[PDB]
Ligand binder design. Sequence first.
Ligand code: VTQ
Length: 393
Amino acid sequence: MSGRVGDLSPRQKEALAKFRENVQDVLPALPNPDDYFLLRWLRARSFDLQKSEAMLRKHVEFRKQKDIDNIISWQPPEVIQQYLSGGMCGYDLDGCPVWYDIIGPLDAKGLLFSASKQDLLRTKMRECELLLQECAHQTTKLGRKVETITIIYDCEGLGLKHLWKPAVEAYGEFLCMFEENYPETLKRLFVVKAPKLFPVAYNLIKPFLSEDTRKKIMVLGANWKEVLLKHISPDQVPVEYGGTMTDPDGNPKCKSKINYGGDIPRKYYVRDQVKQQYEHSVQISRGSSHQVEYEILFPGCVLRWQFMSDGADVGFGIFLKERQRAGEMTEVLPNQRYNSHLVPEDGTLTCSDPGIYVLRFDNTYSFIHAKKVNFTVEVLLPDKASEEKMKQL
Ligand SMILES: CC1=C(C)C(=O)C(CC[C@](C)(O)CCC[C@H](C)CCC[C@H](C)CCCC(C)C)=C(C)C1=O
């Protein structure tokens, strides 16, 4: 069977009955704990009564701690309302709400420098509650249960800026929240206009995604508009995404419903940087240098780093290769001096040729002694299945 209302095996039927008894004591503090609702928790844990109960009880505690009953009435900070991209727009052919995610022009640095991480995550929880409320409205209007959503995930403009570690970590917090609190709610997700970086970028968040969620991700190729119109009526899709919908004023992007992000004006910043810790720490003597070595064997990889120096600037560059001088190696990112004592540095490098990469901190120009550099480096790998998907498409 399928474990859904109208299609339960004898054993799933019995488990649903037992489940309701087992969690009776939390059902009152839920808005609408019908059979559809309960079966989402049971499907998410394959009808394991004990695991499904832990999951739901954790969600009940979540709703209390995060004041979810009142979150739609909570108004997000102005900077977030103005610049957090994405939006609800249209319904698919089954009547499910469609949500657009717009990744390219999202300015995650600006957002984290202008608002609390807590307020950003609360805004995303609120989006989920708004989508569930829309499902409830569709349920009434269409005369049948609607409880899932279709996502259009627009990766046009996805680039190295989106790999910035604090942004990935924050997004991962949201994904975990989504997976723990909104099980069996995603129906299908279309990735559109994915660029070459998509396999690396996806691999960064893949660990936060449930198997159920992973299975619902469809990466689309050049014909993506035609694919969307297999699933959504043209008058429900913006002109921008292949349909006929516009803003009342005729704007093809339907900006009255979809936020397209943009860089946050610096007047909103409350900080210059987020709190950061580093995996490594070195004291570099006057006139000296420090090298850090990473083997990159596989095609498709990206080096990501962050560093800060204490009290003074430092030289930094990347070479391709035995304690070797810089001049003996091949330059891949030309050395330059950075003021990483003032604002911490972060960067990324696409590793087009395999070999041994050397990140070199350079103090050879300096009289200041015992310059302390703190740093973190990782080699980011592409997701293999995604690479293969790209290849064809
Ligand atoms: C608040 C917020 C922040 C701070 C943010 O950085 C991002 C982009 C995260 C990223 C890692 O920079 C870019 C990640 C790109 C990567 C290709 C994402 C792939 C996502 C998958 C297609 C699954 C999505 C899960 C869905 C079911 C919610 C988004 C979308 C935010 O909303």
